[PDB]
């Protein structure tokens, strides 16, 4: 039986409240096992299941920083995207990412993931080959030309290939 | 674990 892992990072800029509404939620197989609401009184990745308890504060520590980091990414890119498309600074928008690894039955990766969607509509996504991308429109095209030169694929490939999977296994063993 | 920081858009 082939298992899987998935994370969904969602941002939402708007009027007034400058800093976007960050929502990082991750699923193992198809169950929620970790959340991160920028709206919480104290932002931080927390377990959504008992078997996630067995994790040294070290884990929850840097794992949260990553988040704290993505926040900045979203607040920064949600801006440039509002530019690629020529919209108003006041208008509210949403930038979402998704990634993860789908291990085969033997354990080795069977499918990687990495994709971004701006305001519901797809934008850019890494193909099954983990080597080529697929743009949606003009702007998505842009990001894909530079990402193609900068060898974006290989970058995410490093994770999706080993790192991610070696961890999905690290999780499965807690249950 | 968590995927590294993403490439600028």
């Amino acid at each position, epitope marked *: 039986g082939p298992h899987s892992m998935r994370y969904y990072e969602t941002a939402t800029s708007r009027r007034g409240l400058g800093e976007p509404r960050y929502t990082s939620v991750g699923y193992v197989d198809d169950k929620e096992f970790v959340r991160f609401d920028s709206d919480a009184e104290n932002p931080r990745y927390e377990p959504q299941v008992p078997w996630m308890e067995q994790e040294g504060p070290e884990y929850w520590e840097r794992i949260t920083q990553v988040a704290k980091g993505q926040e900045q*990414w979203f*607040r*920064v890119n949600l801006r*440039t995207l509002l530019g690629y498309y020529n919209q108003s600074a006041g208008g509210t928008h949403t930038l979402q990412r998704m990634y993860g690894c789908d291990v085969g039955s033997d354990g080795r990766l069977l499918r990687g993931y990495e994709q971004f969607a701006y305001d519901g509509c797809d934008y850019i996504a890494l193909n099954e080959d983990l080597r080529t991308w697929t743009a949606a429109d003009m702007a998505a095209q842009i990001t894909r030309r530079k990402w193609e030169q900068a060898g974006a694929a290989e*970058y995410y*490939r490093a994770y999706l290939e080993g*790192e991610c999977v070696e961890w999905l296994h690290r999780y499965l063993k807690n249950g | 674990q968590l995927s590294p920081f993403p490439f*600028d858009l």
Partner: T-cell receptor
Amino acid sequence: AAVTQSPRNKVAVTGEKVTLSCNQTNNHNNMYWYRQDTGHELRLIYYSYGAGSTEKGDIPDGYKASRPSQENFSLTLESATPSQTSVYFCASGGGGTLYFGAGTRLSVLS
Amino acid sequence: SVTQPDARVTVSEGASLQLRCKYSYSATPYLFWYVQYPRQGPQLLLKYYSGDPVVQGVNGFEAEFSKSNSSFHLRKASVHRSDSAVYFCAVSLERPYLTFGSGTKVIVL
């Protein structure tokens, strides 16, 4: 290699507050500030994810930073001291790679 | 934490050159090799994100990656006079960081 730093060389007096400036054209979001003492390892002091971000590096003590815009990144020395003298490098990068500038050979005086 | 064993390495003009480098990380990181020419900033010589453990670089420079020995050793077939400078070995498994190593002052003859 379109990241420029000014002045090429600066002379700080003990106590004084010096502010090194940076300017890029790589339209990069991530910018950084490394210091290279005696032509050895450069260490990160401060860096920004984007205009308006300020993240302490591995040695921000005595340092302040500002990211007022896409390309302008300013590193500030609260109060210059001997041990705070070296060649500072300002880099930019769209994740993954980093493009450094010419640097700024800043020297402290007592 | 990256570590370049030799800080001072010199070879005669034309001879081959190899600069070692070891990284102590929980897993597969991103390895680079920046060269710094006196009175200038570091330059990106070559990089390795994922794929061929053998990467190519500007000016007949190439490095090999090994998860087994956990090293990213650099090499150049024939080093001319111009190659003399300091070579750094950086890694990054944090947010676009780039922790360098002590480096290595390569000298020719």
